[PDB]
Amino acid sequence: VTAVVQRVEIHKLRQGENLILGFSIGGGIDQDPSQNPFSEDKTDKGIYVTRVSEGGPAEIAGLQIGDKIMQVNGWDMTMVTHDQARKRLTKRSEEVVRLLVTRQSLQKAVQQSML
């Protein structure tokens, strides 16, 4: 890709025997892009963060509502169904979810790098 991507490592919350993300997603190749307020258009099938739990591990790690998730623990998230995205995010054996995300505001980090 050409866009600026940020690595966001989130240690999942724990509740009993469950691990909780502390954030929610929308999108997927099998979903109607219009159900997702963050899809750029009818052709945008990406996975986007739709909610971020206040004070949770996602918020602390730098995750923002509207962020586009490009990768989850090494797995590409650019062209997957919503269910496939959900699975990569909720692996019980993975206490940490390492996301590669992007947002409009990160693009200037490149300007600043140059001066």
Curated annotation (Swiss-Prot):
Q: Which UniProt keywords apply?
A: Acetylation, Cell membrane, Cytoplasm, Membrane, Nucleus, Phosphoprotein, Wnt signaling pathway
Q: In the record, which positions carry Phosphoserine?
A: S53
Location of the PDZ domain: 7-104
- What membrane topology does the annotation report for this chain? Peripheral membrane protein
Annotated GO molecular function terms are: beta-catenin binding
Q: Where in the cell is it found?
A: Cytoplasm; Nucleus; Cell membrane
Looking up PANTHER family in the UniProt record yields: DISCS LARGE (PTHR23119), PDZ DOMAIN-CONTAINING PROTEIN (PTHR23119:SF50)
Q: Which GO terms describe its cellular component?
A: actin cytoskeleton; cytoplasm; fibrillar center; nucleus; plasma membrane
**Which Gene Ontology BP annotations are present?**
negative regulation of cell population proliferation; negative regulation of protein localization to cell surface; negative regulation of Wnt signaling pathway; Rho protein signal transduction; Wnt signaling pathway
Task: List, alphabetically, the CDD domains matched.
Answer: PDZ_TAX1BP3-like
According to UniProt, the name of this protein is: Tax1-binding protein 3
Please give the subunit comment from the record: Interacts (via its PDZ domain) with GLS2. Interacts (via its PDZ domain) with RTKN (via the C-terminal region); this interaction facilitates Rho-mediated activation of the FOS serum response element (SRE). Interacts (via PDZ domain) with ARHGEF16. Interacts (via PDZ domain) with KCNJ4 (via C-terminus). Competes with LIN7A for KCNJ4 binding. Interacts (via its PDZ domain) with CTNNB1; this interaction inhibits the transcriptional activity of CTNNB1. Interacts with ADGRB2.
Q: Which Pfam families match?
A: PDZ (PF00595)
From which source organism is this entry?
A: Mus musculus (Mouse)
Gene3D superfamilies linked to this entry:
2.30.42.10
State the function annotated in the UniProt record: May regulate a number of protein-protein interactions by competing for PDZ domain binding sites. Binds CTNNB1 and may thereby act as an inhibitor of the Wnt signaling pathway. Competes with LIN7A for KCNJ4 binding, and thereby promotes KCNJ4 internalization. May play a role in the Rho signaling pathway.
Q: Where are the transmembrane segments?
A: none
The coding gene here is Tax1bp3
